[PDB]
Design a protein around this nucleic acid. Structure first.
Ligand SMILES: [K+]
Ligand SMILES: [K+]
Ligand SMILES: [Mg+2]
Ligand SMILES: [Mg+2]
Ligand SMILES: [Mg+2]
Ligand SMILES: [Mg+2]
Ligand SMILES: [Mg+2]
Ligand SMILES: [Mg+2]
Ligand SMILES: [Mg+2]
Ligand code: NA
Ligand code: NA
Ligand SMILES: [Zn+2]
Lengths: 151, 48, 178, 169
RNA sequence: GGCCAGAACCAGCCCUACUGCAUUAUCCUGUCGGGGAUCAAAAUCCGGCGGGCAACGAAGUGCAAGAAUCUUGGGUCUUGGUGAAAUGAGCGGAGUAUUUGAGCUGCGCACGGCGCGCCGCACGCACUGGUUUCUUCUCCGUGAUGCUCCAUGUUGGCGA
RNA sequence: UAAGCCCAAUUAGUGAUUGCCCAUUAUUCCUUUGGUAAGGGCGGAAACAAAUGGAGAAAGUGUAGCCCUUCCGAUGUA
RNA sequence: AUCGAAUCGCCACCUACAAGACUGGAGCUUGCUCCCUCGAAGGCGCCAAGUAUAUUCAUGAUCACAAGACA
């Protein structure tokens, strides 16, 4: 029913729902657990901000194919997630030719989102255990059979 | 032999059902040459 | 495993004509892997006994007789097999099984192993469940004892297929290579 | 001693669709087959099992060959074979295997921290005991070296070297 | 960028997950008797009689047409594309209807059992019968005034 | 406790009738080539300069084949 | 010192032995009963030296040999 050209159209699988906890399978933060916040419009990539305080993962977009969305979720209806738009990750063109540099607006968005995400985790009955879950690092051990596991 | 198709044995994968789970997954063979040649993020990440 | 031979009843007759306005109807019991083989055996028996060919006959029915409830029984199987050296040899054997099809399938396996007789040279004359007191072979009657008990010795227990391993530590269950 | 295949013997199914289920021998067909049934299990109606696929347990209920379903159920409930089996370690191991098989990533994390917590506290208790009664390699090595070291250090020259090079520090 | 790579969708194919009709009687039960074997039973086994659905994850028995749309399966580095004529149950509009099947039943005729028309009819044929109790989506829509070929995405890497 | 011989199965008394591996074979897709080949188009429709949508369009056995669509065959000594 | 490399689980609890017609231990009734540590785990390691009051992680911008690797 929804138009395929609309920003609201999506095909994302159900497991990668907002609030779910995802395992990062690739990139700089491989093996880290993170929290799925939203999907960018036009069937875009997911946006994960598994709190940087817990594991160092900032507000970053990631393709859903490079993540394992576990069945363990967190109610994040209290998180706004509205200011996280496609414009946040856009970058100006570079013309023809040590603490990390983060723009002030990006820093404020990270501050507000993480604070609300942490508060929602605290509100959870298993929040302290889930906070430790977010700190845990996933790795493939000798003898592991990931193809046989439930997630 | 037909070299266009490779056969890979993966540890802890001993059933056909187990191998079905890995269909479509990315596979990488790592080796080294003699000289340092161009790679991904050659300019962005010189440490690579 | 479930038996490889199914119990078939084939009802057929010679096609009606002017010389035989109401041909006799014949009923046949056969243990065949499928109904096509069952009909083939029926028409062979009609040709050799009643002088009726398949090209001049009708198959009224060809249906499987279901097995009864699985009960440890003794089956008397009257069977015969052909060989070039000895012609037709007929024997009456007893088997321990839970069904007619299992007992007949066991008899066919026994004939193949101990006499090199294939399916198409074997004729099953009869098969029926018999009481304990009518069993003559001690190898069969030894299972009629009210207190039959024995250990399980010299058994090769293979692990489940998912957990099977190539190299395992000597006195542990840890799979080094699996 | 090994448990015999007899009428009433309780068995566990080793492999197949009924893997790790319990039944009663009920009847013996031949040297290779039996007729297993368990009223309390949903999938364990009376069926034929090969003797290579069954593990004879230690419990035997008092039934006759080819007994009725009611007679088997009464004998099983009276003998308390299933209740007695549930308390053993093998039954707990079988149940724990299913828990691991259906576990999620969160449950795997919970087991990992629980095992590590036990591992940490085992190290604490071992250290407390090993300080008093030396059993580890380093404490044993220290306890053997201590007597000779004290004799080697109780000399005037040892005192001078110790004091001079310590006050220098 | 006419290079490398990853995700998206579109069409076509290629693999699958989801199953209904018929059949079952040498069968299933209860009971009496026999027969059996026990310390005593029970069971295997044979008859008479009374009931029947071993029952849809009963049977490994015959045939299966179950719209990957509802309910977002996998693959396509084994195809071509990013809308340069998207013929779609899939795209666009319009309306809560349409008639497929299943149940339940009217008349006639066929069909089966009994010897003239009587009984039955599993529900066959015609009335495109009726009841809508359950189950469905339904209808309409774009010629080339394009003879032919080529030319229209997204995200990074590399290239200033 | 065959990796031998005879028989019988396809993950097994559970609930149905395709275990797996190898062809210059089969099906299907792309390309070439040749047909006893099958069809369509070929009376330039209109409009459109550069600075800043394009190009072609041959009445044809055979060419860089007039163009397009479609179907079938394709090895081979003398 | 060329030299950039492929390898990706550590241990001072496995790293001793032997038997699968049967080695946790008894009884006699010899296949059953009873006792036990109940006969189906080598220990750790997988991100707070431990299960809590925590804590710097980004701009390496969405995959790319882990851009590091003395556990
Ligand atoms: K041609
Ligand atoms: K010409
Ligand atoms: Mg012992
Ligand atoms: Mg369907
Ligand atoms: Mg529509
Ligand atoms: Mg293009
Ligand atoms: Mg099966
Ligand atoms: Mg030629
Ligand atoms: Mg590297
Ligand atoms: Na070819
Ligand atoms: Na061709
Ligand atoms: Zn017993």
């Amino acid at each position: 029913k929804v138009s395929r050209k609309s920003p609201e159209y999506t095909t994302l699988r159900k497991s990668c729902a907002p609030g779910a906890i995802a395992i990062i399978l690739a990139g700089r933060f491989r093996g880290r657990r993170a929290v799925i916040l939203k999907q960018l419009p036009h069937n875009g990539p997911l946006v994960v901000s598994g709190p940087m305080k817990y594991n160092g993962v900032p507000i970053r977009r990631i393709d859903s194919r490079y993540v394992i969305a576990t069945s363990t979720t967190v109610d994040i209806s209290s998180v706004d997630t509205a200011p996280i738009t496609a414009e946040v990750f856009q970058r100006p063109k570079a013309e023809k030719p040590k603490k990390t540099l983060v723009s002030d607006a990006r820093a404020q968005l990270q501050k507000k989102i993480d604070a609300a995400l942490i508060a929602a985790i605290k509100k959870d009955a298993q929040g302290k255990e889930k906070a430790g879950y977010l700190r845990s690092v996933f790795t493939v051990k000798p003898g592991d059979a990931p193809h046989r596991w439930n997630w | 032999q037909t070299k266009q198709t490779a056969l890979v044995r993966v540890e802890n994968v001993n059933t056909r059902e187990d191998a079905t789970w890995y269909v479509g997954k990315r596979v990488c063979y790592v080796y080294h040459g003699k000289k340092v040649k161009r790679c991904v993020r050659w300019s962005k990440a010189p440490a690579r | 495993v479930k038996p490889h031979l199914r119990h078939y009843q084939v009802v057929g007759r010679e096609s009606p004509s002017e010389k035989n306005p109401e041909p006799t109807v014949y009923k046949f019991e056969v243990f065949a892997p499928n109904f096509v083989v069952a009909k083939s055996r029926f028409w062979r028996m009609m040709r050799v006994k009643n002088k009726v060919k398949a090209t001049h006959g009708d198959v009224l029915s060809c249906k499987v007789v279901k097995d009864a409830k699985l009960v440890a029984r003794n089956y008397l199987v009257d069977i015969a097999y052909y060989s070039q050296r000895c012609g037709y040899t007929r024997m009456v054997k007893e088997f321990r099984d839970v069904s007619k099809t299992g007992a007949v399938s066991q008899a066919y396996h026994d004939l193949a192993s101990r006499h090199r007789a294939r399916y198409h040279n074997i004729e099953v004359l009869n098969v029926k469940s018999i009481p304990d007191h009518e069993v003559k072979h001690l190898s069969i009657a030894q299972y009629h004892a009210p207190n039959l008990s024995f250990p399980l010795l010299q058994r090769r227990t293979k692990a489940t297929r998912k957990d099977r391993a190539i190299f395992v530590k000597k006195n542990t269950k840890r799979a080094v290579v699996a | 001693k090994s448990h015999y295949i007899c009428a009433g013997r309780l068995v566990r199914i080793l492999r197949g669709p009924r893997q790790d289920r319990v039944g009663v021998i009920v009847d013996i067909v031949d040297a290779n087959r039996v007729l297993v049934e368990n009223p309390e299990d949903a999938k364990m109606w009376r069926h034929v099992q090969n003797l290579k696929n069954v593990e004879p347990l230690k419990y035997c209920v008092s039934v006759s060959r080819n007994c009725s379903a009611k007679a088997l159920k009464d004998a099983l409930a009276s003998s308390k074979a299933l209740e007695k089996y549930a308390k053993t370690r093998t039954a707990a191991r079988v149940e724990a295997k299913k828990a691991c098989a259906v576990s999620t990533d969160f449950e795997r994390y919970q087991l990992r921290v629980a095992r590590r917590s036990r591992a940490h506290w085992a190290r604490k208790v071992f250290d407390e005991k090993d300080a008093k009664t030396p059993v580890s390699w380093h404490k044993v090595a220290l306890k053997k070296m201590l007597k000779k070291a004290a004799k080697m250090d109780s000399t005037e020259g040892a005192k001078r070297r110790m004091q001079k090079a310590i006050a220098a520090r």
